[PDB]
């Protein structure tokens, strides 16, 4: 639970984006699932996260309008008690105590779930936990744990950004890379049982216990006191169970096990020389492993019965219990011994590429490891390792070697905190590195890592970091920040890379999310042949090195916003396409169907059970279930299962899977070689479905898309293109094309992040998250792909940049010369806040900046300016007192 102290309703142009809920980490990895980094996406914007905003339930960027007593957007002083259960598929919420009338169910149980709140800006929120971490205003539901009870052992609970590493830090950003997932021994048995029981009865006697089957503390009778020969049968079995476990683990530890006074109220135990004998540290570690196994079987038995610390594995178990178990289990060992028997690449923006001069920057290594630093041309690809291609010149200090189209030793190794500086003289075509302020010796007598290289495009600072690696970039905006500059750069006349630069360098890095890109002709194992009396798109791949490819058509078909013979053909809304699998391609690795724009899941293997699906069951004000809407980013059927028995060896023409989409009802149906499949799907209103097939390359010709039509069903192009909507002839306009999912994309870090004034303390009433800084950005939306990209990111996208520049030119032309009606029409598309942000923003492509300025001066400030300028020549003076004055 959590209270908002004061929520600004209209701090900015839009309402405050306040959502609370639970997010599931993807792939059981520390990387969480939800809004992408550096974007206006909160929780509930994908199948990974589930959110609630006071009036709507959010999942996959679509709201559900959940009803509740006094339904309204979250205002000040709202309890908002969220109850998460994962053994069952249900996540419920209660606004101010009254439960919401509808939960989420059948969400993908896998992955680690955590609470998460997207609080936009201009808000004040404060969580609640148990104990000193907060006050529980409302009582938890029966059989539920506290929020803080799930704290990791030996860890202090704290709150931080869910996925982004943004901290609003200048030239000190810890650009952390990928993380980690985060018969001969029967006498020995009897004698070991004897020794164990006598060791225990020594402690029993030290209290003053006697023997007897009854076990009463007042009578001090201990049945185990009697020797194993006369031990009672039940106590004998109890002792023998642990003796058997001990010797079984002794022989399973990888070492063969065979055969080779004190005050006594009862009898006199006679132990061997347990302490006298010396045991090697390897033996100690092996006995420790035995103790770990014993505690593991203990925990396995215990977990059946109460969230105790012992339930944690031995790795995170408390050291006190670990050591006690270790020594207790090692006592028997001593008795035996005595007897003798996704690497991330960051870089500066390509616009700051330098073709000449002397340049330097520093790279930090907080944790030594897979670190490479250097200069690469703009053509470098994120997937390829830095320095592994001719487009990149890198150096790895940990392995002490340079990388450019090959690996060659260079210099010595570095340690934690060893800054590496990059001397680059483009005029001299020299480039080398200074480790901790001293120049490396290369191999024999050289000092330069690379030389004699064509300038080509300007080289850009770049650094690649591997798993569990932390580094910092220092381009040299301020010389005082540079530490070892005065040792090397000052003497040799190398200027800092960004000393003259007025504003901080935008950083472009390899993005984790893979997006669908149009297939290129030069791409390996990717050849799409466009033939043509029905148009076909066949993929005859040749290299076939990659295992599984995901193919998607360029444009989708949208369903009706409200769900409900050539004549009936024209009235109908069903659209048909088909996929034909060429011989030699195994059908069981082919899945044919539809996807939305939210499918970014990538894996070496694809299964329909791994498809991200969550169904929200929205109920009534009376608690009665009425609607159960199921969401998914992938709707296909398996061609192998669709293959009719014997068609894998008897069908010479291959397998044809025809998909029919009825948009009026949101129904997806499949037909296999004229046989209707029992598998069908129902989609939500206003859903955009992309034709897509996933296939593993087993033959040169895998499969082909056919845009033909079946009787009484319109062709796919009719639903794709609005211009061709009534014509049933199949056509293939150039706009339609196949796109394969790829990881070769770059992402831009915003120069200004959303500063959060989180408490960062274990204060009472719960941790406080407050942010009163209004930050906004313009997002350009591609209607065809149903995706959004920041308008600042168009700098590296030349095609979108040019098209948008010409679109702004078209707006200016159509509203030019005082066309007031067109100006009013364009006022809706081009808004006043948009124009103000565009003109004010320092970071902006030049073409877009000029276009927005011209558009502003045309829609507004145009008619009056022109009329006044034209009138300026004339001079008419009224006969008034001011005129006389």
């Amino acid at each position, epitope marked *: 639970e959590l209270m908002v102290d004061h929520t600004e309703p209209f701090v900015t142009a839009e309402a405050t984006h306040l959502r609370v809920g639970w997010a599931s980490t993807e792939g059981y990895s520390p990387y969480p699932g939800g809004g992408e980094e550096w974007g206006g996406n909160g929780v509930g914007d994908d199948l990974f996260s589930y959110g609630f905003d006071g009036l709507h339930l959010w999942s996959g960027c679509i709201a559900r309008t959940v009803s509740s007593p006094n339904q309204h957007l979250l205002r000040t002083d709202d309890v908002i008690s969220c109850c998460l259960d994962l053994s069952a598929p249900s996540i419920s919420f209660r606004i101010n105590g009254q439960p919401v009338q509808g939960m989420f169910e059948n969400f993908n149980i896998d992955g680690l779930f955590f609470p998460v709140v997207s609080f936009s800006a201009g808000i004040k929120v404060r969580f609640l936990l148990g104990g000193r971490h907060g006050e529980f205003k409302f009582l938890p539901p029966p059989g539920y744990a506290a929020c803080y009870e799930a704290v990791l052992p030996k860890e202090k609970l704290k709150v931080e950004h869910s996925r982004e590493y943004k901290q609003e830090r200048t030239y000190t950003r810890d650009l952390l890379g990928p993380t980690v997932s985060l018969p001969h021994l029967e006498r020995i048995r009897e004698r070991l049982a004897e020794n164990i*029981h006598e060791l225990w009865v020594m402690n*029993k006697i030290e209290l003053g216990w006697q023997y007897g089957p009854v076990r009463d503390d*007042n009578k001090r009778q201990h049945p*185990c006191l009697v020797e194993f020969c006369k031990l009672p049968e039940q*106590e004998r079995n*109890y002792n023998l169970q642990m003796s058997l476990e001990t010797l079984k683990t002794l022989l399973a530890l990888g070492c063969h096990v065979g055969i080779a006074y004190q005050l006594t109220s009862g009898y006199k135990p006679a132990p061997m020389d347990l302490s006298f004998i010396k045991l090697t540290p390897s033996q100690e570690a092996m006995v420790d492993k035995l103790a770990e196994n014993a505690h593991n079987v*203990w925990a396995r038995d*215990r977990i059946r*019965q109460r969230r105790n610390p012992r339930l944690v594995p031995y790795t995170l178990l408390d050291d006190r219990t670990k050591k*006690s178990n270790k020594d207790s289990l090692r006592e028997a060992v001593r008795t035996l011994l005595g007897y003798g028997y996704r690497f991330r690449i960051f870089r500066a923006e390509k616009t700051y590429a330098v073709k000449a001069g002397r340049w330097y920057f520093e790279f930090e290594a907080v944790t030594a490891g897979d670190m490479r630093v250097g200069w690469s041309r703009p053509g470098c690809q994120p997937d390829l390792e830095l320095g592994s291609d001719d487009r990149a010149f890198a150096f790895d200090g940990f392995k002490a070697q340079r990388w450019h189209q090959g690996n060659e030793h260079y210099g010595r190794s570095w340690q934690a905190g060893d800054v590496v500086g990059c001397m680059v003289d483009m005029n001299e075509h020299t480039m080398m590195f200074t480790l901790n302020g001293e120049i490396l010796l290369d191999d024999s007598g050289s000092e330069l890592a690379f030389k004699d290289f064509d300038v080509g495009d300007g080289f850009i600072p770049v650094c690649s970091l591997g798993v569990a690696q932390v580094g910092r970039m220092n381009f040299g905006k301020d010389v005082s920040t540079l530490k070892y500059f005065t040792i090397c750069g000052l003497q040799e006349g190398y200027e800092p890379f960004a000393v003259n630069t007025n504003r901080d360098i935008t950083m472009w890095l390899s993005k984790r999310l893979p997006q669908f890109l149009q297939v290129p002709s030069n791409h390996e194992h990717i050849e799409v042949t466009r033939i043509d009396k029905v148009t076909q798109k066949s993929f005859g791949s040749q290299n076939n090195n990659t295992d599984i490819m995901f193919y998607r058509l360029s444009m989708p078909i949208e369903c009706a916003e409200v769900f409900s013979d050539y004549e009936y053909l024209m009235q109908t809304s069903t659209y048909y396409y088909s996929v034909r699998i060429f011989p030699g391609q195994e059908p069981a690795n082919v899945w044919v169907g539809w996807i939305t724009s939210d499918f970014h899941q990538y894996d070496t293997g694809f299964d329909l059970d791994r498809v991200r699906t969550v169904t929200v069951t929205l109920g009534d004000e009376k608690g009665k279930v009425h609607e159960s809407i199921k969401r998914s980013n992938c709707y296909m059927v398996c061609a192998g299962e669709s293959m009719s028995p014997g068609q894998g060896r008897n069908n010479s023409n291959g397998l044809e899977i025809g998909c029919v989409v009825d948009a009026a009802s949101g129904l997806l149906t499949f037909i296999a070689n004229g046989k209707e499949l029992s598998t069908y799907y129902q989609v939500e209103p206003s859903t955009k479905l992309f034709p897509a097939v996933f296939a593993q390359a087993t033959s040169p010709n895998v499969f082909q898309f056919e845009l033909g039509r079946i009787k009484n069903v319109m062709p796919l192009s009719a639903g794709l293109f609005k211009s061709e909507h009534k014509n049933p002839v199949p056509q293939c306009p150039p706009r339609l094309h196949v796109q394969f999912l790829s990881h070769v994309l770059w992402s831009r870090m915003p120069n200004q992040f959303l500063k959060v004034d989180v408490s960062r303390i274990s204060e009472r009433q719960g941790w406080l998250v407050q942010c009163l800084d209004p930050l906004q950005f313009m997002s350009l939306h591609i209607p065809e792909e149903n995706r959004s990209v920041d308008i600042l990111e168009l700098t590296e996208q030349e095609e979108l940049l040019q098209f948008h520049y010409h679109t702004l030119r078209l707006y200016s032309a159509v509203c030019a010369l005082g066309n007031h009606r067109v100006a009013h029409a364009l006022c809706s598309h081009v808004d006043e806040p948009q124009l103000l942000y565009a003109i004010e923003n320092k970071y902006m492509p030049g073409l877009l900046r000029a276009g927005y300025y011209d558009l502003l001066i045309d829609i507004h400030l145009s008619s009056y300016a022109t009329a006044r300028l034209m009138m300026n020549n004339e001079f008419i003076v009224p006969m008034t007192e001011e005129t006389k004055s």
Partner: nanobody
Amino acid sequence: QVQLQESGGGLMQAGGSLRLSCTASGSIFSINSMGWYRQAPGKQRELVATITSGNSINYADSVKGRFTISRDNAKNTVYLQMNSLKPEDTAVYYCNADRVPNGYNPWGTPNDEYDYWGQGTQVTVS
């Protein structure tokens, strides 16, 4: 999973005879140390007389009265007879079967929590 079902503990006047039957059903391994735990409303939980295999009854401070507890290991069935009843004996009684033999554990923590706590019943005395 070893589940203990306890039936009995009706309500009558003091001095009456009360019969309680506890049956343990589950795994065939680790059957030992059946005990009764008494808890009064909002009061500390006490340990009632505990019987183990071999007719070994472990007594405590709460055994005052007329107790007759007998166990059979063939079906893991325990019969408890209360002859003398007192008003202070009104409490909930839980039947447990823990592998901790007779109430001692030389190993320690890896078995002190090795308890199969079954269902119980409320005994009321007028």
